[PDB]
Amino acid sequence: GIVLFVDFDYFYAQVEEVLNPSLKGKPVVVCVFSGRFEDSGAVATANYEARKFGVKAGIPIVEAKKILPNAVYLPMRKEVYQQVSSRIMNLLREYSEKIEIASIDEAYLDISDKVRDYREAYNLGLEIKNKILEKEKITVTVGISKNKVFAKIAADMAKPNGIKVIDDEEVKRLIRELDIADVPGIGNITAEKLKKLGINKLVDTLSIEFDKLKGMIGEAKAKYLISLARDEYNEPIRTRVRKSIGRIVTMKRNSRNLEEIKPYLFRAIEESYYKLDKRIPKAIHVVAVTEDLDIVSRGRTFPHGISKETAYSESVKLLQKILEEDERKIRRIGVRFSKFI
Template identity: 45%
Template sequence: MPFIIFIDFDYFYAQVEEIMNPAIKDKPVVVCVYSGRTENSGAVATSNYLARSIGIKSGMPLPQAMKIGKDRAVFIPIRKDFYKEFSDRVMNTISTYSDKIEIASIDEAYIDVTEECSTFQKAVELGKEIKEAIFREHGMKASLGISINKVIAKILGDMAKPDGIKYIDEFQVDGFLNNLEVKKIPGVGTVLSTKLKDAGIVYIKDILNRDPRAMIDILGNAKYTYLVEIAENRYNKPVEERIRKNFGRYITLPENTRDKFIIMPIVRKAVDSAYGKAPGIPGEISAIGIMEDLDIVSRSITGGRINKNSAYEIAESLMEKILDSDQRKLRRIGIRIGKITSNESLDDFFGT
């Protein structure tokens, strides 16, 4: 019987901002995507629970959110590169507990701990240990769900928010499914759940008592099969590592500095590491600078097949541009490569 742990970083973007600036953690925090059309045009990317409690939600137009949060909320521009780098660190911690990890998004992951745990209770104990490690090492609160498959684990993780943990073993699953509303199942959105409700389907078990042809008309073959497998407790899609589109390496400098004689050799080391992970030759390369105040500045170039020898020069040039455009000292540097195509020969890879 598989033991699956689902991990969800609570209100991730906003929580990262709270971690980096503890002075705002007791305030409504709103992470914003500015459109650039006007000073305040854009939308809310996410918000912490305090902001949600006063009515500021994801997707809300910024002018409306600012009206609600006037003199109360903290509005922060989104910093995607920084959140990705923070997520990578937390995911690295999680990956030390199992080789079978599926990173579902920047703030969600599944791990299969069947080989690590001889009983379900040991899986629960391990889940608690992982949750504590995430908070201890990164200050990040997470919600966990633990069960026998990915779907039930995710539903439990959603139910455990915020900062909780819920679990159901194999002996409790049937009872759980008997009372599970179909709208809580991953992949069943608002529109589809409304159609199912109109057809008399409120609980997942209801689907087993309906004409399959009628259900397929509403759901389509794939989703009908998916829901029937869940209802009959036959769903068993394994935890699978996602195919990575980007490969990179971040390295902390010995000290905060702008000294190129210190920085550039580490840039080359990061290039070596990134190319060592990639299964082919990239068509895109980015240099990332994490500044002394933890802000992130990046520069990228796209085009052609960039062999490793060329990448050294390109990466150094991109880092030069970061240093020329910003007077702050660097704390960490990163190199990320993407748009990978397969190697044709070692000469292609190394540029010889």
């Protein structure tokens, strides 16, 4: 069984680099402008030139302009990026019809049926890597191993524009010495509530009885982490089904004025239904982001699917339900649809 994994390199930035190659070789930042004030919003990504100086997805745009004033700052055009993602995901279908899209910029292939061993799997990476670069001028990073998780770790090890094979043998080696915070699924919170025990390697979980870990990071995470170390984890490439669609926007000013919020919430509803096209949801949730950036929400699941008009009415009640029970002023407002028929 062989999984080959692909993740494009600083995607949104790279795409923009492709459309304006003069940018190439100098710092580039792609931003999500909120509209609150000039430069309000966060970074969605930045090229490696920009990263040297501290500019990465997630930081406030002011921190970045502060820290890297003379760089290109471009507005995010997700839609344009999605075409390029789509056209690349089509190529990956050439090499394998068993493909799992994981994000806008990555995907796993099952190539157990195309190649015979890691050596040929490696050669395939080179072809896959070269087709994309010929038909889209986009470099990408390939990881190759015995399953999703390790194929993803190998990719992370080789970024950017790399290619790494993790063999039955080197898997032994990492399960033993790979830091625990570098395992997919393990973030700050956990990998700090892990050093709590003395677990530092994927291997150190085998050294603490189930019981203790179970009630420290939860049933699903424990079962998962242990089967990795014990080396029995095996999830198949499965086609993912979008399970929810949403929209959330930031308001010019914080409000508790229902009449002032409503327009924003209605904006969020129109663009979700467009975004739904055809799919019928039975569930709605209004999501509010508050002054202090706590995220609060109220939902409702219906017996039968929710029409656009039903959603206008329902969301409003839910907003009120939120206004009734949170004292804080609202800063961002949004909506999410789910439980699709």
